[PDB]
Structures are given as C-alpha cells and as structure tokens.
Amino acid sequence: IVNRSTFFVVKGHKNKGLIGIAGARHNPLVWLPTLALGGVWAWRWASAGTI
Amino acid sequence: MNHERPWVFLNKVTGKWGACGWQPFWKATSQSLNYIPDNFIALRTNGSWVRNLWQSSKVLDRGLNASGYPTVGTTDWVRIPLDAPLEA
Amino acid sequence: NKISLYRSYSTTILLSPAYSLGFCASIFIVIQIISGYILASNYIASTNESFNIIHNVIMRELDTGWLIRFNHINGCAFLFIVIYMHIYRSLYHNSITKTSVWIVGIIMYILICGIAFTGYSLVYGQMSLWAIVVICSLVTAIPFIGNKLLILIWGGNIVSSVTLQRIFCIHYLLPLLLILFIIIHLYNLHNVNSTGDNYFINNRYDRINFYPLLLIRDVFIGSNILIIYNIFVYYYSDLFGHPDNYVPANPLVTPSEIMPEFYLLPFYALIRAIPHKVLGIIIMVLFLLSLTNLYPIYFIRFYNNINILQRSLLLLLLLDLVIASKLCLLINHYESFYLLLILSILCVLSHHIYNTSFNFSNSI
Amino acid sequence: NKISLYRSYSTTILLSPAYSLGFCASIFIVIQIISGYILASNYIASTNESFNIIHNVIMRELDTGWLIRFNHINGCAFLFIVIYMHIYRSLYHNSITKTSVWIVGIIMYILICGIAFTGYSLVYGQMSLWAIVVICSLVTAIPFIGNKLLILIWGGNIVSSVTLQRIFCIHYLLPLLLILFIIIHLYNLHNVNSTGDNYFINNRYDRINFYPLLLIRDVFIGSNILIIYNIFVYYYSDLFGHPDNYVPANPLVTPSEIMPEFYLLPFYALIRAIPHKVLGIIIMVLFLLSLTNLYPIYFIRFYNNINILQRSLLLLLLLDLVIASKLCLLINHYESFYLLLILSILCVLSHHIYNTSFNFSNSI
Amino acid sequence: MLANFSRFFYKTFLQSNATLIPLTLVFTYXXXXXXXXXXXXXXXXXXXXXXXXXXXXXXXXXXXXXXXXX
Amino acid sequence: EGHSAYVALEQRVNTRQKGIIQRHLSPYDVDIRGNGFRQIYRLGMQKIRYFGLIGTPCLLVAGAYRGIWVFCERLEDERYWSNAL
Amino acid sequence: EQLDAISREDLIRVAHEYFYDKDPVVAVIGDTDNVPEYDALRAVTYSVDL
Ligand code: HEM
Ligand code: HEM
Numbered sequence A: 001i002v003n004r005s006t007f008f009v010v011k012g013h014k015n016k017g018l019i020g021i022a023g024a025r026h027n028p029l030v031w032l033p034t035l036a037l038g039g040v041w042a043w044r045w046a047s048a049g050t051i
Numbered sequence B: 001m002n003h004e005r006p007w008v009f010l011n012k013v014t015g016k017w018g019a020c021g022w023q024p025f026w027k028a029t030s031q032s033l034n035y036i037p038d039n040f041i042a043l044r045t046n047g048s049w050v051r052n053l054w055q056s057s058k059v060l061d062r063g064l065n066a067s068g069y070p071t072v073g074t075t076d077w078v079r080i081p082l083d084a085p086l087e088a
Numbered sequence C, D: 001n002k003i004s005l006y007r008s009y010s011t012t013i014l015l016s017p018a019y020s021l022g023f024c025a026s027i028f029i030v031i032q033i034i035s036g037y038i039l040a041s042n043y044i045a046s047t048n049e050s051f052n053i054i055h056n057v058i059m060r061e062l063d064t065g066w067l068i069r070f071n072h073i074n075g076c077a078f079l080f081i082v083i084y085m086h087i088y089r090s091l092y093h094n095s096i097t098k099t100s101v102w103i104v105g106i107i108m109y110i111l112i113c114g115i116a117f118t119g120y121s122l123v124y125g126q127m128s129l130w131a132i133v134v135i136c137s138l139v140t141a142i143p144f145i146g147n148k149l150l151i152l153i154w155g156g157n158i159v160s161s162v163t164l165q166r167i168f169c170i171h172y173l174l175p176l177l178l179i180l181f182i183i184i185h186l187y188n189l190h191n192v193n194s195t196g197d198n199y200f201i202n203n204r205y206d207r208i209n210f211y212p213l214l215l216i217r218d219v220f221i222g223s224n225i226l227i228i229y230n231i232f233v234y235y236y237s238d239l240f241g242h243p244d245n246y247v248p249a250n251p252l253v254t255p256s257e258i259m260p261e262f263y264l265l266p267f268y269a270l271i272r273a274i275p276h277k278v279l280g281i282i283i284m285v286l287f288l289l290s291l292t293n294l295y296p297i298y299f300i301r302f303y304n305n306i307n308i309l310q311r312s313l314l315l316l317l318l319l320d321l322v323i324a325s326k327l328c329l330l331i332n333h334y335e336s337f338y339l340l341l342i343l344s345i346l347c348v349l350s351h352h353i354y355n356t357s358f359n360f361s362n363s364i
Numbered sequence E: 001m002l003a004n005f006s007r008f009f010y011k012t013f014l015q016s017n018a019t020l021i022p023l024t025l026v027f028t029y030x031x032x033x034x035x036x037x038x039x040x041x042x043x044x045x046x047x048x049x050x051x052x053x054x055x056x057x058x059x060x061x062x063x064x065x066x067x068x069x070x
Numbered sequence F: 001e002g003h004s005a006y007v008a009l010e011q012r013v014n015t016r017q018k019g020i021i022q023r024h025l026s027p028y029d030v031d032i033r034g035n036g037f038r039q040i041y042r043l044g045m046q047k048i049r050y051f052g053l054i055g056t057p058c059l060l061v062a063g064a065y066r067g068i069w070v071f072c073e074r075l076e077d078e079r080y081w082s083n084a085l
Numbered sequence G: 001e002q003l004d005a006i007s008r009e010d011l012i013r014v015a016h017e018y019f020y021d022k023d024p025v026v027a028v029i030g031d032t033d034n035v036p037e038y039d040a041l042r043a044v045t046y047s048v049d050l
C-alpha cells in the first residue's frame, strides 16, 4: 500500500495492536449506527427550570 | 451446499418403507438459459440412487430383516443408504 | 544504615554543571508554590476588589507583602528561563532517547504555560483583561461550537467576577498537578538514569553514588542562580513585565499594543504569522502535539546518535525563535517586518529533532 | 493482555458487604472534591460578602447551585458516617495488625476532621464565627505562648476577612493532601491484602481475582448508599446542620448554645469534661496520639486474636461515645448531667484496643 | 419455545457489540430517560394541578381582568 | 537500583567483567588546585574551537537577518518621515 | 469424497458456532499458582471489537 520497504522487521513483532485481533475485525462501517446514535443521544442539554 | 445423500426410511413393526432426502428450494425468479441443473438431491453423484431405489423396491416390499441398520431416534424407523444396490 | 543510603542510586561521572538545571527548576517551583500560597491567603477575586487588594492590601498592609509578590513574579520568569535552558540542553545531548522522561517533561511544559497564563489573568489590570479577550477571540474561531464554548469559558459575554473566580481556582489547582508530574518525571529518570555529557553503558564500578556529591553540586549551582535571581527581585523587580498592567482594567479602552509575557511570545508569533484563525489554531495544536513522541507506537523505532550539524541547527532554531518573538511584537507599527516574521516562523516549523531512519528506503 | 489484568491482584473470598465501606468513603471523597471545586469557583472569602454570596449568588443565581451546596454539606456528613462505620469494622475484625494501613488511616481521620472544621468556618454565620472563637480560645491556654500564637493564627485580635481567607486556602489545600494519603492507604493495603471475615493464610488457589467481581459488588453497595445519601440531599437538606448558621454573624452577639457538627461532638465532650484548660489540651493531644500505633518502636511486639469479650466492649465504646456527645450538648441547661458526661468520658478513655502480652510477666 | 427464543435473541442482539451498544442506548432513552424520568415528571405535574403555578397565574390574570372592568 | 532499566541493559549487553583494576585516592590526599590551571586552559581552548565550529551557520544566518532588518527598519523610517503611512 | 467438498465458509461457521463466547472446561495438573483461573478464561472467549 505504501510501495516502500520502510518498516523494520523483527521476529514475532507482528499483528500487534490495542483493541481487537488482527484479521478478526468487522467492517468499520458496522459502527456507524453506534456512532450516530451515541452522538445524537449524548449531545443534548438539560435544565432543572428553576426561576 | 453439501447435505446427506437420499436414503430409505423403513418402519419395522409396521413393515413399511419409503425413500426420502433433502430438497433444496429457493424463491422463484427468472432461470438461466445456459444451465441445466446438476444433481442436487444426491450431490457429486452420477444419479445412480434412482437405479438403486428401483432395483431395491422388490427387496424392500417383499420383507427385509433390517435389524443390522441404525435407527432414527427412539422411533421404529431405520435408514438404508442408496449408495449401492440392496440385495441382502 | 548510612552506607545503604549512599548506594541506593548511582549515576555517571560525566554530569557537568549543566545538569543542575532540573534542580534549579525545582527550586523555583518551590518558590512559586510558597509565594502563591501566601498571596492566595490575602487575595479576593472580583472585578471590584482584585486590583485594589493587591496594590492596597498585599503590598502596603503587610511587612513584606511587596517582597512576596516580587518573588512570585520573578520566580515565574526565572522558572521559564531555566526550563528553556533545560529543554535546550536535552535537545543538545539527544535526550529524546529517554522517552518516558521526555513525554512527562512536555506535559509539564504545557501545564506550566497554562499556569503562568491563568496567574497573569488574576491581576485584573489592563493587560490581563485584554490578553484574556484576545485568547478567547482565538477560542471563538472553532467551527460550529465556538461561540457557545466561549460563553461556557467566560460565564457570560464579558470577563467578570465569576470569570476571575474560576481562573483563581484553576491557578490554585494546576501547580499541584504540576508537582505530581515532577514526581513522575523524577521516577522515570531514576528508572533510566541520566545521559551525562556522552552516552555510555556503565557497570557499577564506573558509576558513582548520587548522595552527597551531586546534592552538594546542586546546592552550589542553586546558590549561584539564586544570586542571579535575587538581583532581579530587588533591583529589576518590574523588568519582566509591562507597565500597562499597573493600570486597572478598563473594558471600554484597549491598550495601544497587547503583548503577552516574554515566555509566551513564540506562541503568539505562531498566531500572527498565520492569517487564517482556524489554520492558526490547528497549527498551534499540531505544534504542541508534535513536540511529543507518541507516534509511531507499534512500529519499530530506535534512536541513533547526534552530530555537529544537528547541534549547529539547534543553535539556529534558538536564533529563529528569538527573532520571531521580537518581530511579532514589532509588526504592530511597521508592516514591512511581516517578511522576516514569516521567514523565521517557517524556519522554526522545519527543524528536525529526530533523525528519521525511515528517510532511506527502497520501493517495491 | 486482559488475563494479566484479571490476575494483577487477588484477595480472599470472605469479603462480606461490610468491606465496601472504603469504596463508599472514596465515593464521598470524590463527591466532596467535585462539589467543593464548583463552590470555590463562585466564592469570595470576606466578612463583608461571604454569607451573602453563598445564600444569594451561588444558590439563587446559578441553575442548581443550591443542589451543589446541599451535595457538599450532606456529603461531608455521610463521609463522616461511613468513616465511623469503617473504623468500627476495622476494630471489630482486629485490623490493627495491618500496621501501615491503620496508621495512614488515623492520619487521614485527623486530616478530615480538620477539613470539616475549616469548611464549616467558611460560611460566615453565627455558628461558624463562635465555633472559631471557642476553638481559638482553647488555643489561648498554651503555656508561655497562647496570645502570641493566637494573634498569629487569627491575624489580629478578632476574626476578620484575612482569617476567612486563610481558612479558605487551607480548606482548599487539605483535601488534596487527603487524596495523596488515600493513595498511600490503598498502596499499603494492596501490599498486605485484606482480612475478610476471618484471617487465613491462603495460597493462590484459595484467592480470587479482585476484578471485576469486587468492582461490581462495590458498584452495587455504592448504588444503595447513594440512594440513602440522596434521600437526605433532597428531603432532609439541613438535618445535620444548625439553623443559627443561617444568620449572618454578629461579633457583638453570642448564640444561646454553641454546638459543633455532630462528628466533632466527642472531641467537644473531652473539652467540657475537663475543668482545667491545659489538662484538656494535653488529654486531647494524648488521645489523638494514642489512637496511633507508633510505640513500641524497637521492642518486639505482635498481635494475637480477638474474642467475644473484646467485641462486646467495642459495643460499649460505641454506646459511651454517643451518650457522651448528647450529654455534652445537654449540659448547657441541666447541670446534673455532668455526672453522666464525666462517667461516659472516663469509660471511653479506658477502652482497650490492643491487648498487650506485657500484661503477664514475672519480676527479677 | 424458550430455547429457540433465547437462541434467536442472543444470536440477533446480544452476540455483537455492534448491536448491543445501540440496544443499550435505546434502553437508556426509550425507558430510563423518556419513560421513568419523564413519567415521574408528568405524574407529579398531574397530581398537584389544582395548586399549580400555571393555575395561579391564570387565575390571577382572570381576576385582574375582572377588577379592571369595574 | 537492581530492578532498573539501565541495570537490566548493562546485564543484557555487557559480559561478566574481569581483569579491571581501579585505584582511588581519598579526597584528603588530593589537592583541589592540583590540576586547575591546566584544565582551565585546555577546556577554554576546546570550547573556543568548538563554538567557533558550530556557531558559524548561526552567525551567517544572523548576518542575513541583520541585513534584512536594517533594510526594513530604514524603509519604515522613510515611510513615517514622509507621511506615507 | 466428503473431504474435498468442505467449504472454507462452512469450516468458519463450525468454528464460530462452538468456540466463540462459549463456556469451556479446563483441567490443570501442576503448579496452579501460575495457571489462570476459570473466570479470566471465560472472559477471553470473546473480544470487544468482535
Ligand atoms: C498553588 C500555587 C500557587 C498559588 C496558590 C498561586 C496564587 C496566585 C495568586 C493569588 C496570584 C495573584 C496575586 C498576584 O498577582 O500577585 C498569583 C499570581 C501569579 N502567579 Fe501564582 N500561584 C501559584 C503558583 C504559581 C506558579 C507555579 C506559577 C508559574 C510560574 C504562577 C504564576 C503566577 C503569575 C505569573 C502571576 C501573576 C504575576 C503578576 O502579579 O504580575 N503561580 N498566583
Ligand atoms: C518543572 C519543569 C521541569 C523540572 C523541574 C524538571 C526536572 C528534571 C530533573 C530534576 C531532571 C534530572 C536532573 C537533570 O538531568 O537535569 C530532569 C531531567 C530531564 N528532563 Fe526535566 N524537568 C522539567 C521540565 C522538562 C521539560 C519541559 C522537558 C522536555 C521534554 C524535560 C526533559 C528532561 C530530560 C530529557 C531529562 C533527562 C536528560 C538526560 O539526563 O539525558 N524536563 N528534569
């Protein structure tokens, strides 16, 4: 994808990440409903109506 | 798709038989001109099970001692495979 | 067991006197903490009493309240000077290899800039008010949620007493978080030890006990730098400041030139040299984020040595930063200095701290 | 490595719901910190406009400043309730054996008492002013420096805005030291683990992973405690307070009865039951010092088990403390209760926490 | 019935976080926030209606109208 | 100190040391003036040479900036003196 | 004959049916001081990303 051999290769230093498992991750488009609903739900103001 | 080859149910106490198998089916739509459907009931076969059923019909209707065949659950039915002609 | 006290930590023998700048910064942090705690015990944050309670109560009702205030001011200025020398030495000796120490240091630097700004805001003078106004005008350029954001920051359409009170709470709170970050800084350093003049891997026979030799050297250098510091406290008390902050704030009048403190001037330059406000905000955020070392994370990266070309370029970076500060102050009247201001800012933005080994590779 | 997270720390299976009191105390510490930081961002410390800005600006101009203030008050009350239950549990299960945990806990208790007092002082009402006056008068009894020290503490002959400003700064500062001491408390506990219902020496096959089971138990117990806590924030908002503190302070007028907060009453009792002021101060200091476990230092000591007799005497201690508080406040109108107050104080002062194996020995 | 329904429910909703998170948000909104909170609000507003602030304001306007035309 | 990253590094990289002899004199037997003037001279000369080396690019760029500064300053003086602002 | 008719998708379905988010049975003999307990093992049969 980069068209370069610009990464140092080390024995076993492969498929390292934070959240998921390499090669066992969903299509990133499956999280769009989650993000949309979360943004719409969270972004709301609330007032007690004290005069 | 890969399911079981067609078989023959046989009920012992009643002594009554009958072929059976898995029929795939899909929602009806336009067909294809350049395609004659393959063998779908007996996948990856030259369709000999029809010949085996025809040959074995006389054997089965005449009365077969199928005590050496597996049963189906707790019922009185046993399964006879149609891979090869049945003579017994 | 005094022996067990001596040998609890050992360092290299190549710690030249330039390696006491951390101790000097610690001294000035202590001075700021104590002076600020004494000042806060006599401080009221409001638009009707703040300026008065500094110049009429703190500096004239106590025996040496003036001395305490001058300590606070000049200690902030000297803390920034010493921190800049500390950073310059760290860049000179390729101390970015101490990854934990460097990241914690950058966090501390950003925190200290914030502390200094919020503290300068507490003297409700002309410069304080109008610096707040200008920085918040920078804030309101955020797309979509800028204006509302500004209101939440100010609690209103103008700077007022509630604004001063929240600024006071922030100014009080932050230095203690800075203390915790200093503790983490030192913990990481003691985990990885000090570079010295040159980097060597030493066994215990080549190292020396930290206590008491380096503590005594720290005392010596600290006394010298305290002499230099107190020369300013008693004889140049107002040299690191702008006289317009002795004029009580007038929201109806803007000063002729709004100029921040000398230690924030470079950032101010980054805003004057970028015409688009949104682009300036983005570039400031990228500048601060790029000072860190948080990327790459899971790609193999290691650090090589540093050379004479890199040291000369570091000196050039210092020159460019100083020129940018002076010019960004000078551009208000003379418009022909935009050329040199932009040139210096572009030169600053194109300085290499880490020599990318990825500079050299082959294509598929 | 999620698995490594599960096994990072393991404890005993005998953690009854009574072992969430520390978690509840931490919850109320968090609530106090947040609500206090919000209050302090709207607060001006001065006799002229302190009582006014609490009752007229914070409560009536903000949207829910009243709710913030009620949260803060009832959070202090419930923090003390939970800490008292926490101490009672630790005495019940013979947790004085966790020497470091116990000593840090006692230091934290003293700090929190100071925080509560200095906080109550900030509401410049009648009760606050006169509680300060009484305490500082108790300061005046020290030999050879009571008046010099009292003047230094108050900044004059009378409580004034400088005194309020000192108190405000101390109230702001102390809770952060308290957070540091809570961190040390938990660090020590993790070092020596928990007791549970009974004490056993368990190998790793008899211990359970702390996370997430005990975190979920903590969430459940904290939810129930927060229900109970909010039944007071919204329906009994001044049950723990005194109405005289809703009166702006007059230095010329003394209240009919000067009673501190319900969590300081035991200490007040010690003052009332000792006619001599110096002796009362000495007894207070000795009481606070004897709650700790700092002696013997180098003599060999170890802790044995606890029994039904000790637990029954612990119940008696609780009874005596409560009765002493009530009587200490009653004795202002009814002189005959002095007998019962003194009896309860005497019973309290002679309660055995640590059964000393030095009770039995021979003579040369 | 419960076995098949349980299998269907798990495999459809609870198996994947991509569905469980929106299900939890739906619960928060259409059950906790707009079903318990708003419910209690409406109930309180309805129980105490005769002495409501709005009722007092309306009666005041009416009485003022009456007093003015006299 | 034994559980520190630099100790771990020295254990991984360096061998088990052998055949090293160190001699130390107590400071009460060492004269503080012993090697003072020679070191002052040597270090002064070294720093002079090194700063002459690494300071040259900064000097050149500062000269160019000084030229630009003079030009702009006198341009703005001329602008102000002729009411051309 | 039945072994060359297996599909990779069928194999994936079989693997997902019986491994993902299922209760395992563990047997341990030896120094159980270092072998993780069941609860932790039950929490690693699924991933947050999925
Ligand atoms: C908890 C610690 C601190 C407290 C309580 C504190 C408190 C205060 C108070 C009350 C003022 C206003 C009084 C005055 O202006 O003279 C002030 C001003 C100031 N503080 Fe702090 N401060 C603390 C730490 C720091 C630190 C670490 C710095 C950064 C070096 C700092 C920088 C400043 C500056 C620059 C001013 C304004 C200078 C001026 O008056 O011109 N303070 N501080
Ligand atoms: C409050 C400000 C700061 C204080 C008090 C402080 C304190 C210290 C101290 C005591 C040391 C060890 C002694 C020394 O080597 O000088 C140190 C080392 C170091 N600091 Fe800081 N520091 C501060 C800011 C920074 C900043 C902003 C950075 C930049 C990232 C930084 C980076 C480093 C590095 C890299 C080292 C180790 C240098 C080496 O030995 O190679 N520090 N600091």
Ligand code: HEM
Pocket: D029, D032, D033, D034, D035, D036, D037, D039, D040, D043, D054, D069, D072, D073, D075, D076, D077, D079, D112, D115, D116, D117, D119, D120, D121, D122, D123, D171, D172, D173, D175, D176, D241
């Ligand atoms: C840094 C954290 C804290 C800050 C900034 C803070 C600040 C304040 C301020 C400004 C007040 C006066 C406003 C008012 O009286 O409503 C106050 C009152 C008070 N605070 Fe805090 N506080 C903090 C933490 C705590 C803690 C941990 C406690 C312990 C229980 C506490 C106990 C009290 C009490 C008892 C009062 C007076 C109660 C009353 O208003 O009647 N505060 N605090």
Ligand code: HEM
Pocket: D018, D019, D020, D021, D022, D023, D025, D026, D029, D083, D086, D087, D090, D093, D094, D095, D096, D098, D101, D102, D103, D104, D105, D106, D108, D109, D182, D185, D186, D189, D193, D194, D195, D196
């Ligand atoms: C700010 C108030 C306090 C907080 C937040 C706090 C928090 C905690 C926590 C989280 C634990 C471990 C969990 C538990 O066993 O409940 C704990 C244990 C303990 N605390 Fe505290 N604590 C506080 C005050 C005290 C005080 C005043 C003492 C009295 C000395 C004390 C003595 C102990 C003891 C002895 C244990 C261990 C009990 C055992 O496992 O046997 N704590 N505390």
